[PDB]
From a paper:
Chromophore formation of [name] ([name]) is a built-in type of posttranslational modification, i.e., the chromophore of [name] forms by an autocatalytic reaction of the backbone involving cyclization, oxidation, and dehydration reactions. For recombinant expression and purification of [name] ([name]), one of the variants of [name], [name], was used in this study. Here, we demonstrated that the second posttranslational modification is generated at the side chain of the C-terminal Lys238 residue of the [name], a mutant of [name], when over-expressed in E. coli BL21 (DE3) pLysS strain. We determined the crystal structures of [name] form I and form II at 1.65 Å and 1.28 Å resolution, respectively.
The species with a higher mobility was named [name] form I, and that with a lower mobility was named [name] form II. The differences in the observed mass of form I and the theoretical one for [name] were quite small, and its isotope pattern was also similar to that of the theoretical mass spectrum. [name] form I was eluted at a lower salt concentration (~158 mM) than form II (~180 mM), which suggested that [name] form I and form II have a difference in their surface charges. The pI values of form I and form II were estimated as 5.76 and 5.64, respectively. The overall structures of [name] form I and form II are almost identical when these are superposed, showing 0.145 Å rmsd for Cα atoms of 233 residues, though slight differences arise mainly in the conformations of the turns consisting of Asn23–Gly24 and Asp155–Lys158. The C-terminal α-helices of [name] form I and form II also show almost the same structure in each other, except for the slight differences in the side chains of the C-terminal residue and the adjacent Glu235, where the electron densities at the end of the substituent groups in form II are more disordered than those in form I. The regions around the chromophore of both forms show almost the same structure, although the alternative conformers of the side chains of His148 and Thr203 could be modeled in [name] form I and form II, respectively. These observations support the fact that there is no large difference in the fluorescence characteristics between [name] form I and form II. Therefore, we concluded that the majority of native [name] exist as an unmodified form in the jellyfish photogenic organ in terms of the C-terminal residue.
Numbering used by the authors: 4 to 64, 68 to 238
The structure:
Amino acid sequence: GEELFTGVVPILVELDGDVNGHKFSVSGEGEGDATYGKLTLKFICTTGKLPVPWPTLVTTFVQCFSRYPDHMKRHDFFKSAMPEGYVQERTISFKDDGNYKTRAEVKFEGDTLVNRIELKGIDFKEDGNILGHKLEYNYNSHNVYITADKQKNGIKANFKIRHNIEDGSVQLADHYQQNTPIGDGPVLLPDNHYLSTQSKLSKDPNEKRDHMVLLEFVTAAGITHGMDELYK
């Protein structure tokens, strides 16, 4: 399970979306190195111009690449579900605007880790920050808290992403997330903890299609009192 992530793993991301009548598709490719919690991914809109801002799709576009420190090995649900994979479902509610409903399956196809996503967008304002592309092209860091879900054999998370807006304000995107294994093999159900994420957005100067370059680092954290005792 975890042994599938000891080296660099090629990643493929595929999303099909429909946001207020606008149908679109995105393909992403890169690689993950879970030993450093490092993701390098480049996304291309294969249907033309993206109808929503790129930053709003960052969370939707593979937490199995998070760095789980050795003392937290027993809490890494995402890798324990591999190679069969897990389903990741989200609702993302944008304050004073519409919402996304996403469903993804993340699993290995051979050596490639594949994230296949369906996105539906509803009730957006045609003049709002999303459909109006009024978000800044950047991304803040966040701590995502993970909890187990015994009765559904998986985990859940909820967190509020802060998106910077052109006019100086901040647009909150409230995420509710649920992950469940695809396989029937047992998986690690974690103790409460969090994932510390940082993301940098950039552009490829040679890319003519609408696109996003993403560099991301994720580390699991929060289980500390045991280690701290060693240094008293």
